[PDB]
Symmetry: D2
Subunit: 331 residues, 4 copies
């Protein structure tokens, strides 16, 4: 299976390189010429195109990974529908809802897979907890807890065009909530503060947030987010149900424990992007390919992307109105 990748930023590059551990990297494309040939050589790719559309039209290209900037997503995904190429699109699909509907509509017409880039679904720990809950191991779920904290904020100029913490960061946790609980959120309440850097405040965003979710069954969820955990990534999930509790913890660098007069000390948490995420991207990409090879529905759909976006809008509205907000209000 021949794959073409568009956009060789940090994530496009991970996917491009991961291909040799899977299906074939057959084409790359990026608007920086330097990087383009550098990578054509480095990775040994058959074709390099500086214009995304050529790559989409090359008949040896069975599927496209769109990993370009966000403003670019709608156009390229719609272009793949045209060429009748299956398409994976990195997070987020779009921040504009009408664009999302078109991406969904157009790919549906072309009868081509649209896979949304929610990589955490393929984290081995989160996927295992997902399966156990779905298998009945904690009975009927009552309360979901998600904590998601990054080691540092992204750049301010980024934050300014990000759509805020609920669209840029909580998006992954909204998707995770639906995935793990296996039912829709109907209502959201959100609050957020500026506790890490005054500039995030001046940009109109928050760096610390809590979101409550009310699911169709009556089960409740709480997400909490922070842009700066000094100890590294903190991404934990818990589900509590009629028959017990299940929890997914962080991964540490090592299994080594030092004991001195103050007690035990474990190893540092995962802190760096690649050590934290490379396996989830690898496993996500293999699933996208598996889906294409078998003409399966995508493991993560355009719909999934749209619901996550809608929950983000409900939370932005809740934050401003100081009340919980039903998803209707926002569709």
């Amino acid at each position: 299976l021949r794959i073409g990748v568009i956009g060789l930023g940090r994530i496009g590059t991970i996917h491009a390189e991961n291909l040799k551990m899977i299906a074939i990297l057959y084409a790359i494309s990026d608007v920086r010429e330097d990087r383009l040939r550098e990578m054509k050589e480095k990775l040994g790719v058959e074709k390099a195109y500086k214009d995304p559309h050529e790559l989409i039209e090359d008949p040896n290209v069975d599927a496209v990974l769109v990993c370009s900037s966000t403003n670019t997503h709608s156009e390229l995904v719609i272009a793949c529908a045209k060429a009748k190429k299956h398409v994976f699109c990195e997070k987020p699909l779009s921040l504009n809802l009408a664009d999302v509907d078109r991406m969904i509509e157009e790919t549906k017409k072309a009868d081509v897979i649209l896979f949304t880039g929610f990589n955490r679904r393929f984290d081995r720990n989160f996927k295992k907890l997902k399966e156990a809950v779905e298998n009945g191991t904690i009975g009927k779920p009552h309360v979901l807890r998600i904590t998601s904290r990054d080691p540092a904020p992204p750049p301010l100029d980024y934050i300014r065009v990000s759509g805020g913490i609920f669209l840029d960061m909580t998006i992954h946790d909204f998707d995770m909530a639906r995935y793990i609980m296996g039912e829709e959120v109907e209502e959201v309440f959100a609050d957020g503060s500026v506790l890490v850097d005054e500039e995030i405040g001046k940009a109109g965003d928050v760096d610390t947030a809590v979101v409550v979710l009310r699911f169709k069954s009556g089960a409740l969820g709480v997400i909490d987010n922070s842009r700066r955990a000094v100890y590294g990534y903190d991404q934990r999930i818990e589900v509590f149900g009629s028959k017990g509790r299940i929890f997914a913890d962080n991964v540490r660098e090592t299994t080594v424990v030092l004991t001195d007069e103050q007690g035990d000390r474990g190893s540092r948490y995962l802190y760096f992007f690649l050590e934290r995420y490379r396996d989830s991207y690898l496993e996500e990409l293999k699933t996208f390919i598996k889906n294409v090879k078998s003409g399966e529905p995508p493991a993560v759909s355009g719909e999934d992307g749209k619901m996550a976006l809608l929950l983000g809008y409900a939370a932005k509205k809740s934050l401003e109105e100081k009340r919980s907000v039903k998803l209707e209000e926002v569709i």
Copy 2:
């Protein structure tokens, strides 16, 4: 020693009365309970000097220096005001009252009489939560940003009790609101609450919920989230975490034993604490020694009437939030 009288020989009054042997320079001098055989039996089991059917006779007994009010909640106000009129130092089990005006009167009268009013928030004296509070207070996690509390019981109380309890926010979350203030060292300004009926439809029919989440906004902008369940089948689950600018701190549940069994499926740890006495006995013992210390030493109580009042107000704000589906400021309830 100090001579103590205990009113109410229910589950918790009995614990306090028995702990008095474990405490020194305090003795159990008198007990009172309205069930005559209960009173008779406990007088003889514990070798108590005086047993009174009428608690007012206990309070007026001149040998009694301080009183533990552990009778039904609807009697707390009357008994605590009666201690103030008798000039007796008073400890009152949670909750002080479900009626805000009664709590204001209780605080007024004891203050007038110049006697201690100590509110029985025993979890402040849990060795794990206390150590976490001290670490936070010390600067160990930097400036606090997010609080998390999970508090789940192995089983709901009986329906009869649920109907008169004021609902989950006044009867259960009350401890978590106090813990929040105690751990974070600042006031809550706003609350949002939701709740569902997921354990017993009867709780729902009685107008209450059995599962709830409560969001707190503190004065500093720090946020917190409490979640409660009336039934965790694995036993008590009471965890606290604080996340701040310099790290994270967490207090876990206690297990029965340090033993770990490993088989084909992996490691299996010991059961969680599950029964009331094994869970709570040490926190009650330590709470009571503190009350006695404050009394003997003339100190302000470690947990005051005002602490009882604030927890109740947060409960009323949450009850209003639940019904109005919106964030509620403490002021709208003050």
Copy 3:
């Protein structure tokens, strides 16, 4: 049940005080006039004898706790036997195999209970582990691991007359191995070194040791000891068998965990004698009293005291001769 306690050192005093939590502390005895008066008062005890033989002969004393120095044990225990008093004896019964055999002989003669003070069998975590093993939970036991480390060495003078690490420290581990595995050790190999304190070696003992056990079934055990673990007591037991593994860890002060840039940090280990052991001593004493009251064989017998002493001799011999030593040789 009226108990007399002989010798009010660290442990005697703990037994004496626990009696309030249980049976009555009727009589106390200690050669130190001052310590005696000071304890009669503070514990409110009826009788106080500077002469232990008085206490044993008191007709109102039903059972005796012998918690004086090891060299007094044999005489007091035989004396309780003579006066028909059930007797509890603190670790160790004796360093002298002939005494032990006598203590056992005399007590059997007088038809009284002789309970050996191996309190660790009554540690809540070690007891739980023992019950799981006996229950079949890990199937047939194959390998036992015991690590036992104290936070500091006892004083030099004490070490000089202690009998060496195998008699003074490993004794508890020898006994725990027999208790946990439910069968006898037939052969032992030991080695030891001086890594903590030069003076311990100067007194002729070792401060670090390892002991291999061969059990009747062919199961193997390994004990390691150290006189000094700066982090607190380290007392772990692991049993590995045909159906799984079972482990008892040490106890921490608290369940609190602090996380910073270097990772998670837990609370300190138990470090002081009383927080570490008081609960085991209380449960041990309750069990002895229960044995007394119900006319039961003691939970921990003279013969238990004897086997642990024999295993200790087998280990001192292995250490000197650099080979495995069968119990038959000792």
Copy 4:
């Protein structure tokens, strides 16, 4: 850097495949006596050369370095052929069960001036290596007591056990090496004992399936290794070092970080159980280091002499089992 792999067994195949993930080296040649395996793997890996005769692989001038992953009785002759062809050589454990052969392997590679790297892959286990570096940095002060527990989920086949040299040469070998690696000093004396508790047949072959080995180090520090051929729960490979300033421990790895809680308490995920999930990363990192040593002209990270010492410790333990006493390393050198 063009690599040739001899022996496409379990471990040879893992090395062959890992070359894909090592930028400075490619799999250029493979060789194995089974014509079917050779044709199969040639296709599967897309290898340029496949040689039925490992000597032709060795003499191929395009081969820069060789991984000898063939049966043990083959190692001596092929490593000596590498020295003759002036090819750097990595040899899978064990180097040889025969001491005179180990000496010739060492002598010949030294005379040819090529690296001989012994495949003790567990030194490259990320947990064990981190513990070794911590001990080396002084974080537990002076080491006093070493504990190693090493249990496999199941025994090898009996036909294999018969020619394995017995538990101390086939299994404990890894632990003897780890002991020297972690403690950074030599073992002067060993005591060993062992029993037959897993499978009667193992003992009929003259072996044991459960063993303990005490180590006395030059410093006076003491160590104890215990082994078992069958832990139902998976690999159990733990290391603990205790010393004057504290204790350090490397635990087993679990499949996931997920914990399930019910009436009886917490339940963690299964331990690693299959060969590949357990060992693949240690082999990847071991090979990378070998490639590094070769490229940079460095001494091997694990030398022939490392292999010889682990063998000598094996012999000392075998003697101790039989003589029921402690055995000095001198006795067997």
